[PDB]
Amino acid sequence: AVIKVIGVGGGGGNAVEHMVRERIEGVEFFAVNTDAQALRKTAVGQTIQIGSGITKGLGAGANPEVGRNAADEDREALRAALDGADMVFIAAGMGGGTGTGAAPVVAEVAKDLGILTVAVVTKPFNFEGKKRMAFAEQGITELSKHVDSLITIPNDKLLKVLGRGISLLDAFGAANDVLKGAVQGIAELITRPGLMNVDFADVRTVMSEMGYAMMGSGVASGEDRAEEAAEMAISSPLLEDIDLSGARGVLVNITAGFDLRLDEFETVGNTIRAFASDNATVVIGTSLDPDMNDELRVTVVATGIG
Numbered sequence: 001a002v003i004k005v006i007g008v009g010g011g012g013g014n015a016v017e018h019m020v021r022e023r024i025e026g027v028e029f030f031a032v033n034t035d036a037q038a039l040r041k042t043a044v045g046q047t048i049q050i051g052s053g054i055t056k057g058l059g060a061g062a063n064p065e066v067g068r069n070a071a072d073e074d075r076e077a078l079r080a081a082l083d084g085a086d087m088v089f090i091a092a093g094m095g096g097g098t099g100t101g102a103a104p105v106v107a108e109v110a111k112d113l114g115i116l117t118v119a120v121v122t123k124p125f126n127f128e129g130k131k132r133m134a135f136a137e138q139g140i141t142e143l144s145k146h147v148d149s150l151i152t153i154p155n156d157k158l159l160k161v162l163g164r165g166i167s168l169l170d171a172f173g174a175a176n177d178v179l180k181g182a183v184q185g186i187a188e189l190i191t192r193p194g195l196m197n198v199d200f201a202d203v204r205t206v207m208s209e210m211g212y213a214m215m216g217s218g219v220a221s222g223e224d225r226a227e228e229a230a231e232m233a234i235s236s237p238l239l240e241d242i243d244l245s246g247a248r249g250v251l252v253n254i255t256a257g258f259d260l261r262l263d264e265f266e267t268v269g270n271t272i273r274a275f276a277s278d279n280a281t282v283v284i285g286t287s288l289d290p291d292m293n294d295e296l297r298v299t300v301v302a303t304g305i306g
């Protein structure tokens, strides 16, 4: 499996840098930006400059029009980077000029190539202002036209569960971890399975041409960890208002060490199928993280929600 993760713009590039640091098994990372300096800074091993860096006016690059035109002009470079992938993840912070405008073009290029294309993006914090929130939603409207699944993370919802005198860096770190959670949860079912390997056709079925999606995750240790982690995932703040019996698809990743047991696989699957519909596709897989000993994580991606 060839899986590529593309960070688009400053925010997405920061999120993908977090994914590089904290590791996602068996994926290739890319950063796509108008900002040549940013691409020079980044730890991402593959970079793609779009638009070659021409602005017209101080702050003119905050307009999504600029990101869209830049990616439009460099569609051939994007296609050469994406081609050969079985799956593409697009990460972006929506609301700025580059991510908002260029992420839907990156998605369109991937989708036109026949690649299963999953976007995981954020909306700005409320304190960033109404102009950025409006740009973000307009970009998400365009992005939804060109992806198989779209997971939109409201940064403002993350901010409320963080409180305190958190730094802005940690505020964006919280969004980064959610984005990583979603990408890693989907991709590692393919790139490093555990005792139960998912068929890629099933991943395609739950994610393909599905529209809106949402991710929740949970972790637990000890004897009841499998049921505990599944329940925490189901009840996480991101999934709590999703009726899981209204999701057209559910993809579940159980991640644990070598000591994952078959009966734990069965428990998690039975729990998830108790909340989902039989008129839905439910896919349960495992990933192996040899560094985990006692802990078990369940990540749930609900797709085709409305």
Ligand SMILES: Nc1nc2c(ncn2[C@@H]2O[C@H](COP(=O)(O)OP(=O)(O)O)[C@@H](O)[C@H]2O)c(=O)[nH]1
Pocket: 008, 009, 010, 011, 012, 014, 015, 061, 062, 092, 093, 094, 095, 096, 097, 098, 099, 100, 122, 123, 124, 125, 128, 132, 155, 172, 173, 175, 176
């Ligand atoms: N996760 C993350 N999000 C960011 C960061 N900086 C900005 N954002 C969010 O992403 C949105 C777009 O900002 P930015 O990506 O820098 O603009 P762009 O490069 O033109 O797309 C902002 O409005 C913020 O909500 C960051 O370092 N990490």
